[PDB]
Design an enzyme around this catalytic site. Structure first.
Site, PDB file in Angstrom:
ATOM      1  N   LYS A 108       0.850  -1.199   0.000  1.00 28.18           N
ATOM      2  CA  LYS A 108       0.000   0.000   0.000  1.00 28.18           C
ATOM      3  C   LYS A 108       0.899   1.269   0.000  1.00 28.18           C
ATOM      4  CE  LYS A 108      -3.325   2.328   3.074  1.00 28.18           C
ATOM      5  NZ  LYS A 108      -4.463   2.127   4.015  1.00 28.18           N
ATOM      6  N   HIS A 242     -13.505 -27.756 -34.608  1.00 26.32           N
ATOM      7  CA  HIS A 242     -14.470 -26.904 -33.886  1.00 26.32           C
ATOM      8  C   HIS A 242     -14.982 -27.569 -32.590  1.00 26.32           C
ATOM      9  CE1 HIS A 242     -14.078 -24.525 -37.361  1.00 26.32           C
ATOM     10  NE2 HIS A 242     -15.266 -24.660 -37.935  1.00 26.32           N
TER      11      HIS A 242
END
Lengths: 485, 505
Positions: A108, A242
């Site tokens: 942070k 496919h």
């Protein structure tokens, strides 16, 4: 005297805090930080290890004023402990507390502090510092890695607890992936895509010898690889187009397996994905190189076989550097739906599914017919439903799918087989869902089907059994449904 | 101000609770119930002020969650020795034990500055000490916790299940932070991707009875927008609902009706009203429509409920349902009815899509049919489509894009009249579509055709001429595209190339 509670974030402090569980490369990293002008703070065993190796270090106590601008902290091996032991109290002891708070707090404060939570980053960090490249963007990317590290740690803990006590279906489910690579595009060129792995499956077992796999190539590889690795050391060849199989055969050798797989549908195999359960040699390579396939994945590839495709620009060749194909066995499956996902146990064709099936008919299948049924069952279970699979002498001879009715799917399958000039007499038939009426058996009698495997479970099962008995067919009810959307 | 987290220690039988929450729902009544059970209460910031304000005896502790920036919060990870009740009587203000920890969590500088550090450290430390302390992260558990305490049911297993919830809560918080950072700096494709779901419910089974199944949600979409008025959805019902809902909500406030069977559309129509839309959607395939899933973009009234009830369907999902409409289905068992308590159907619009493959997943941007996809399409033919034909093409495009490829969709006067899919060729798929339309006694003359994959040869057009197709919409991109154009010109057909493919496995 000093403790970690007395340490605060300060830019230009030139003071590093080193407190790690995984002590790999910490001595050399401490020596390199000391040479760069950093003062070193350390705790417990890390401190003793550094001092022992002649590093100028000052000890601070663990909580169980001095400024710092580098936080090098990593966590108790929770994952390794759960893999190595079932002792729950030992597992609870390896939950790091304090360590994540230090990592998250330094992250942070990235504008002022460097946060390191991985020994694999030490050498990169040292070179960045030597080159005078420790800027705000460099510390921002370390901050991202820090929150990925603490998110991954707690996600692993939560998933493990829910696997041990809630059957793998907890209140919060974390599907965590580590990027392997970005694909050129997603399902369509206008979409972006990437491949993620749970552990190291793709990183450790796949090597691209030519080209780069597309997003659709990867789902097609998955389908072809899963089928071609379902028969141990047999020389299986799977051809997928496919997402669906358009070819499958096991013959005397891989060249014969390829020629018979291709016979089912040559038209669809053009631009397909080929999975080879064994060596891709020069002979097999030339045979495949008669048509333009998009992908070839083999267990291992010869140098001369790779040279055969020097001309084709869009073909992709993959190796596993193994005698036979290696697949993954995920316990769970999931499907995206808008707003979330549905989660379930992975489907699988049990090793004794055909062996434990009920013989419903007068006739019993022969040893060769039972091998063909096993092949037909596995293809049907891996194929998107509703489908019909026809197999003859170790090779798929017809396949029907996608239609609203399987009677309509079977007629499209027979039409393609007639077009391919294939003799269906003596073939076997599998379906992943029960046949509702005897018309399914009457249609099968037209092409001379000799054996059928299906789950059973229709209200009209008695008329299905009677129809099979009229034609003298073998009929097996497995009691296991394999529907797949 | 006086007490700090450095003065607190985890201790079994301390009879002292620490309450510090972002989600303050039910915290007053929970604090009152803990006080009645003999607990002393410690609290911080906004939670302290709320408790004190409501007459609860509470002592303040310096705010550990809020934010010289120190390395870590002063939270002790160990335990104080458990003492008996008679030892407490015989007997101190500098070292306070705690046995209940009730903590829950909530411009670039603003997001970063608001990352909670003390809250997760407190939750994770208490959770690890579950053998000695209770950790509470969910206000939905407060009433259960009070009853467990009153009944003397607080045992090691009860605290273990609370520990699991605590690590799910802190894992979820850091997973949301990491996903946000990767969305902002790495285009949503970071080094570590977290797909997090919250369980809605378990299904009776998965895709097949031998599999277990459950539904999971992102940000409570299913919890907030779906209400079962009758029955329970199966695993396969949910994937069918998803498909029907996505289609019926693709035309804004238009009165769309979508009918889905085994994940594919078998009916679709937009007419003057919902009753007319249902009648025309059912005409395409009455047979597949049996035991199907119906999505209604609007009100399911008594009239529409009575028209649907003529046949058997497994599921009905409407934006809103009238009381009289629900009453129509009191007798039958198998039907399931869902509502969204909304004027029109609600979608989630997930930005990303993912597919499971063994060992991992593939990840991508979600596909979408752009609002100007047909408007920006290239007119390739002599003939231009009429205003009605352009509306039908728009419908045909969207159905084709949502249907599993390779497919062909035929639409006439706002209603789907034929659909072909699944097999190896689109010429084979079209023949199956025409066969079903002839069986249904539907006039295909003047209909439009869409495919979300390019047509490779003019044989696709010559087959379309047999049924009198007047307009075609396709992405385009074949070598012999000029031959596909010549065929459409011979038959006097409108032909559009969108340049956008919508292939879907």
């Amino acid at each position: 005297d000093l403790g970690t509670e007395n340490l605060y974030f300060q830019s230009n402090a030139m003071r590093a805090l080193l407190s790690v569980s995984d002590k790999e490369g910490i001595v050399e990293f401490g020596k390199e930080l000391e040479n760069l002008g950093f003062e070193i703070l350390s705790t417990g065993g890390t401190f003793k290890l550094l001092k022992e190796n002649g590093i100028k270090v000052i000890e601070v106590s663990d909580f169980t004023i001095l400024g710092i601008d580098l936080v090098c902290v990593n966590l108790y091996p929770f994952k390794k402990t759960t893999i190595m032991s079932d002792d729950f109290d030992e597992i609870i002891e390896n939950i790091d507390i304090g360590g994540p708070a230090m990592i998250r707090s330094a992250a942070k404060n990235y504008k002022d502090v460097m946060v390191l939570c991985d020994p694999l980053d030490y050498e990169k960090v040292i070179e960045t510092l030597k080159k005078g490249q420790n800027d705000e963007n460099f510390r921002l990317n370390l901050m991202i890695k820090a929150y990925e590290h603490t998110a991954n740690y707690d996600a692993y803990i939560a998933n493990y607890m829910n696997e041990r006590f809630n059957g793998g279906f907890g209140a919060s489910k974390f599907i965590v992936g580590q990027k392997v690579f970005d694909t050129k595009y997603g399902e369509n060129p206008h979409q972006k895509g990437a491949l993620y792995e749970f552990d190291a499956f793709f990183s450790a077992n796949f090597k691209a010898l030519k080209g780069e796999a597309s997003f659709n190539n990867l789902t097609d590889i998955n389908a072809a690889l899963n089928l071609a690795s379902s028969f141990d050391k047999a020389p299986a060849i799977a051809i997928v187009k496919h997402g669906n199989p358009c070819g499958f055969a096991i013959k005397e050798n891989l060249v014969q397996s390829y020629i018979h797989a291709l016979k089912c549908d040559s038209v669809s195999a053009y631009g397909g994905v080929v999975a080879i359960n064994g060596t891709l040699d020069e002979a097999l390579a030339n045979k495949i190189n008669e048509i333009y396939v998009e992908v070839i994945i083999a267990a291992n590839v010869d140098e001369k076989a790779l040279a055969v495709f020097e001309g084709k620009k869009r073909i992709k060749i993959f190796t596993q550097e193994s005698p036979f194909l290696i697949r993954s066995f995920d316990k769970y499956d999931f499907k995206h739906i808008d707003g979330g996902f549905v989660y379930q146990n992975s489907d699988e064709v049990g090793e004794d599914e055909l062996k434990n099936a009920k013989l419903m008919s007068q006739r019993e299948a022969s040893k060769e017919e039972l091998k063909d049924l096993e092949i037909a069952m596995k293809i049907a279970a891996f194929t998107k439903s509703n489908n019909v699979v026809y197999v003859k002498n170790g090779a798929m001879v017809a396949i029907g799918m996608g239609m609203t009715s399987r009677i309509d799917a079977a007629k499209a399958a027979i039409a393609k087989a007639k077009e391919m000039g294939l003799d269906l007499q003596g073939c076997v038939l599998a379906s992943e869902a029960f046949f509702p009426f005897r018309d399914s058996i009457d249609e099968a009698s037209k092409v001379g089907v000799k054996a059928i495997v299906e789950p059973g479970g229709s209200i009209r099962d008695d008329e299905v059994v009677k129809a099979a008995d009229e034609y003298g067919m073998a009929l097996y009810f497995t009691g296991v449904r394999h529907f797949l959307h």
